[PDB]
Amino acid sequence: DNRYKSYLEGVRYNVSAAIGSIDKIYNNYKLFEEQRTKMYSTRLDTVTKDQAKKEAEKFTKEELEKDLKELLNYIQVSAKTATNFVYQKEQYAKQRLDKLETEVKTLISEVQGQSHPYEAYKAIVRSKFLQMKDSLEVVKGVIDRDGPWY
């Protein structure tokens, strides 16, 4: 019905948003790591090291924690709406979102434990983080299709 379409539209919206968060954090980590390496390089001059230090100092622990909180919020709202997908073609999305919610809660718990930006990033971009985009893309494929599942 039209109510079900509204549920699909909202989950699609939030899962896309979550994937944006996953892409943002990972890329922020990559850039942070690149700039940190430069800033401590033995083969680079002070001008270059200085610029790297300035770019590295922008990656705060607070931005990461807020990014993970945003990610959790999009996923947890989606998981609740996805109860409606039980016994429907999109059902597989419900279990995957519940499990992602649990996993992102763990990452937030990790980031709080750490005090410095680089170590917080290093603690959270590991095995389970690095499968999250793939899992959300599985969800996306379940909830937003333009033809059969081949």
Numbering used by the authors: 222 to 371
Paste lines from the article.
B. miyamotoi encodes two separate bbk32 orthologs denoted fbpA and fbpB; however, the activities of these proteins are unknown. FbpA and FbpB both bind human complement C1r and protect a serum-sensitive B. burgdorferi strain from complement-mediated killing, but surprisingly, differ in their ability to recognize activated C1r versus zymogen states of C1r. To better understand the observed differences in C1r recognition and inhibition properties, high-resolution X-ray crystallography structures were solved of the C1r-binding regions of B. miyamotoi FbpA and FbpB at 1.9Å and 2.1Å, respectively. The crystal structures presented here of FbpA-C and FbpB-C show that a defining feature of the C1r-binding domains for BBK32 and B. miyamotoi Fbps is a four-helix core with an extended second alpha helix that presents a functional arginine residue on a small surface-loop.
A structural overlay of FbpA-C, FbpB-Δ5C, and BBK32-C shows that the three proteins retain an overall similar structure around the conserved R248 residue (BBK32 numbering). However, we noted that the area near BBK32-K327 involves a minor structural alteration in FbpA-C and a more major alteration in FbpB-Δ5C. In FbpA-C, the kinked portion of alpha helix 5 extends one turn longer than in BBK32, resulting in FbpA-C containing an additional surface-exposed residue on this helix. Each of these key residues are conserved in FbpA (i.e., R264 and K343), whereas in FbpB, only the arginine is conserved (i.e., R309). SPR binding assays showed that FbpA-C and FbpB-C bound with high affinity to C1r-CCP2-SP with K D = 0.90 nM and 1.4 nM, respectively, whereas FbpA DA-C exhibited no detectable C1r-CCP2-SP binding. As expected, in light of the C1r-CCP2-SP binding data, FbpA-C demonstrated potent inhibition of classical pathway-mediated complement activation (IC50 = 23 nM), whereas the FbpA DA-C mutant lost all inhibitory activity. We found that B. miyamotoi strain FR64b FbpA exhibits similar activity to BBK32 for both fibronectin-binding and C1r-binding/inhibition. B. miyamotoi FbpA conferred levels of resistance comparable to BBK32, while the FbpA DA strain was as sensitive to serum killing as the vector-only control.
